[PDB]
Amino acid sequence: SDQTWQPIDGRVALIAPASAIATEVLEATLRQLEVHGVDYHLGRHVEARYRYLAGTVEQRLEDLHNAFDMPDITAVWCLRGGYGCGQLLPGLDWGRLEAASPRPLIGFADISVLLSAFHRHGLPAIHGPVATGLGLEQQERLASLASVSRLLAGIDHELPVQHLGGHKQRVEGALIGGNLTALACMAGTLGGLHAPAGSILVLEDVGEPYYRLERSLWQLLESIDARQLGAICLGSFTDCPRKEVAHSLERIFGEYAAAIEVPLYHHLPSGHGAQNRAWPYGKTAVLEGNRLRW
Amino acid sequence: PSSDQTWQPIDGRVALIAPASAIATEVLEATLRQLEVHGVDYHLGRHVEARYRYLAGTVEQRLEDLHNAFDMPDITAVWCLRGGYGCGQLLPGLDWGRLEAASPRPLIGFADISVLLSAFHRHGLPAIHGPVATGLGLQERLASLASVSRLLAGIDHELPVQHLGGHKQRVEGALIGGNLTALACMAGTLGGLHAPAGSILVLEDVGEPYYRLERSLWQLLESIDARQLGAICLGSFTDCPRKEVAHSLERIFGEYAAAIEVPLYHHLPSGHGAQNRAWPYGKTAVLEGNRLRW
C-alpha cells in the first residue's frame, strides 16, 4: 500500500539549505518523523533566520557538511525549499561529500538546484517532498510523503506518464530536472543544470503566469544541449494562472519540444500539488508504454 | 536651454517595430498621433499588429520587421513599441551583417528590450535605454518621453544619482544593463548580458518580491565577470512589495555589491515609474558624486 512507510535504516539528517522554517511547522515535522520511528539528526542551524533564508550561507554550509560527517546518516532530507540553496554551491566541499557513505539528498522545488549539482558530482539524490511537508487530496499528500521512505528502501521503481503527440517510442536516459523556474535561474552559473546526452528532463512549476514559464523554458533549453535530450517529461504546473492566454501551456511546451525534435510526455505525478511522488535523481530510467521505469 | 518637456526634432524616419509583446490597437493609434503632433515621420513594421499568444507574432514575423528596419535606407532610429517578453527569441536568427551594413540608427527601448540593447552593444551598434514608443499613447512622464528625441539629438548629458555603498571614487565605463529580471533570464544563452570590464551596470525592476529580485541578482552577477564591473547603479524598483521582509532592498543590494567589491549608486531616474529618463546604451559614462554623465 502506498500510504505505508518503509522503515528508514540508520539516521536521517535534517537540514534547511534554502528558506527559513516556522517553529510550529518544524516541531510538527519532528513529531511526525517520531510517529514513524525515524531516527533523525537535526541540523544545529535549522531555526536560523537571515531575512527569508534559513541563516547565512556559512550557517547552512556548516549544517550540510555536518550531515556528511556523521557515519550513521543514510539520507539527507531537506526541510524546506523556497529559495536559497544555489547560494551554497560555491562553498561546498565536494570531496568530503564523495568520501561519505551513500546518503541520498532529498527535496524538490528550489532543492532541484542541489539535486542537479549532486548528480554532476556523482552523488545520489531524490526528487520528492521536503520534510516540512509532514508538518502542514490529503491521501495523495500522505502517499507522496510515504514515497520517500519507500524509494530509499528500493521498493518503488515506476510512475505513470502519458506521451503527448509524436509516435510510440522507447526513451532511455538519466532522470534530471525538477522545478523549471529554479533551474532556469541557475543558467549561466556554476549551478546550471547537468544535462548529459539522452537525459529525460522532468519539469514542474507553481505560481507562474505562462509568459514567465515560456521565458524560463527558452532560457533552460538554450543553455543546455537540448537537441540531445531523450525526452521532456512534464509533471504538474499548479497555481499557474492562464489569464486569457490564447495557447494552453501544453501547446507552448509542445512547440518547444518540436523545435528541438525531442518527444514530450506529461502528467507525471511530481510537483507542487498533492501528487509529488519521489523519483531517483540522476539514475537511468526508461519511458516505455504508459510509465517511467527505473 | 529648454525645458525637459520640450522635444527635439527627429530627422529622417523612425522605424517602429514590435520584437517582444503584442500591441493594443488603441494604444498604437494614440502613439502615432503623438508622433504626428511632434512632426516625427515613422514607418510601422508590416507585422507590428501580429499576435501569437502574448508575443507580437512569430519569430519569423518579428525578424522580418527587424531586418526590414535595417534594409530601408531612410531610417534614422528604430523605436521599439513595447517590451514585456520575447525579443531574446530573435537572437538565433538575427543577421548581424545585415544590421551592421546599414547606416547608424539607434535602437530604443527598455524592460525586455534590454536584451536587444545588450546584443546591439556586443555588435557595436548604437542603442538607447528609455521609454518604449507606446508610452506615448497611454510631468515626469512627459519629460521621460521627450528625453528620447533629446538624446538622439545629443543635447542631454547627465542624470542625478546618489552614492549608497563602496568606494566613492570616479567610475568610468560603458553603460550597460536595464531590467534585472529580463537580463537574468538570458544568462547561459547566446543573449547573455554583454558586460565588459569596467562597465556601469544599471539595474531597475518592477513588480517583484524581494526573494525574486535576490535570485535574479545572484544569477546575473554569478553569470558575468561581476568583480570586474566598474559600478552598480540602481534605478527604480517600482511596486516591489517588501511584505515584512526583515532586510531592506538597499540592504540586500548593498550586501551583493559589497560581496563583489563594486561601488553601489541609486536613485537613477530610470525604470518603470514616472521617472524613465533615456540614457545611451553602451556609451562610455562617468559616475562621480551625485551625477552620471556622458
For this entry, give a set of tags.
homodimer; 294 residues; alpha/beta; Rossmann fold; Glucose Oxidase, domain 1; eight-stranded mixed sheet; six-stranded mixed sheet; globular
Summarize the structure.
Chain A is of the alpha/beta class and 294 residues long. Helices cover 29% and strands 22% of the residues of chain A.
**Sheet with the most strands, sense and barrel status of chain A:** 8 strands, mixed
Radius of gyration of chain A: 18 Å
- Which pair of protein chains has the largest interface, and what are the residue counts? A-B, 28 and 30 residues
Q: Structural class of the secondary elements of chain A?
A: alpha/beta
Topology of helices and strands:
The structure is a homodimer of 294-residue chains.
Chain A: E1 11-15, H1 23-35, E2 40-42, H2 57-69, E3 73-78, H3 94-99, E4 105-107, H4 112-120, E5 125-127, H5 138-152, E6 158-160, E7 162-164, E8 171-179, H6 180-184, E9 200-206, H7 210-223, E10 231-238, H8 249-259, E11 264-266, E12 279-281, E13 284-288, E14 291-293
Parallel strand pairs in A: 1-2, 1-3, 3-4, 4-5, 8-9, 9-10, 10-11
Antiparallel strand pairs in A: 5-12, 6-14, 7-11, 8-13, 13-14
Helix pairs in contact in A: 7-8
